[PDB]
C-alpha cells in the first residue's frame, strides 16, 4: 500500500528515477520489493512525470519526457494499530491544516 498509489493504484515511481533502476537490479523478489518500498515510502504524491524545478526544455532528446502517467493524488501515511491500518493525509506546507486520518 505504501509503495502503490492510493487512487490509481500505479507505482509511485518509474524507470525515470535512477534509484528505481538501482533497486530493479536485485534478482530476489523480496529484496527488490524492499528496495522499491524503501525508495517509494517517501514519495507522498503520485508523480505525473513532470519534474517541477527544471526550466531547461531540451528538444534534442525527447526520449526523456514520457512519464508513466500518474494522477497526482496525494498519498497517505500508513500506520499499524493492532489489526487495523490508519491512513493520514497531509495537505500543503501550512501546519495549521490537520491531517485527515481515516481507517
The answer to whether 3 is annotated as binding is no
The answer to whether 40 is annotated as binding is no
C-alpha cell at 32: 527488490
**Residue recorded with cell 533502476:** 21
Q: What are phi and psi of 12, to 5 degrees?
A: -70, -15
State the DSSP string of 42-70.
S--B---S--TT------S-GGG------
Helices (H), 1-103: 18-24, 29-40
End-to-end CA distance of the chain: 13
Q: Is 97 helix (H, G, I), strand (E, B) or coil?
A: coil
Measured CA to CA, the distance from residue 11 to residue 36 in angstroms comes to 9
Q: Which helix or strand (DSSP H or E) is residue 101 part of?
A: strand 100-102
Measured CA to CA, the distance from residue 69 to residue 57 in angstroms comes to 19
The answer to whether 8 is annotated as binding is yes
Resolution to one decimal, Å:
2.7
Q: Do the strands 84-89 and 77-81 form a parallel or antiparallel pair, or are they unpaired? A: antiparallel
Q: Is 4 helix (H, G, I), strand (E, B) or coil?
A: strand
Handedness of CA 30, 34, 39, 42 (dihedral sign): positive
Q: Return the number of other C-beta atoms located less than 10 Å from residue 45's C-beta.
A: 13
Give the determination technique.
cryo-EM
Amino acid at each position: 500500500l505504501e509503495c502503490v498509489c492510493w487512487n490509481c493504484g500505479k507505482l509511485k515511481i518509474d524507470s525515470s528515477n535512477p534509484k528505481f533502476n538501482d533497486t530493479q537490479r536485485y534478482r530476489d523478489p523480496k529484496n527488490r520489493l524492499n528496495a522499491v518500498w524503501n525508495v517509494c515510502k517517501t514519495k507522498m504524491v503520485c508523480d505525473t512525470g513532470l519534474s517541477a524545478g527544471s526550466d531547461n526544455f531540451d528538444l534534442s532528446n525527447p526520449s526523456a519526457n514520457m512519464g508513466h502517467g500518474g494522477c497526482g493524488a496525494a498519498q497517505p501515511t500508513i500506520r499499524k494499530d493492532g489489526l487495523r491500518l490508519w491512513g493520514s493525509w497531509k495537505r500543503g506546507k501550512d501546519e495549521s491544516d490537520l491531517p485527515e486520518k481515516r481507517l
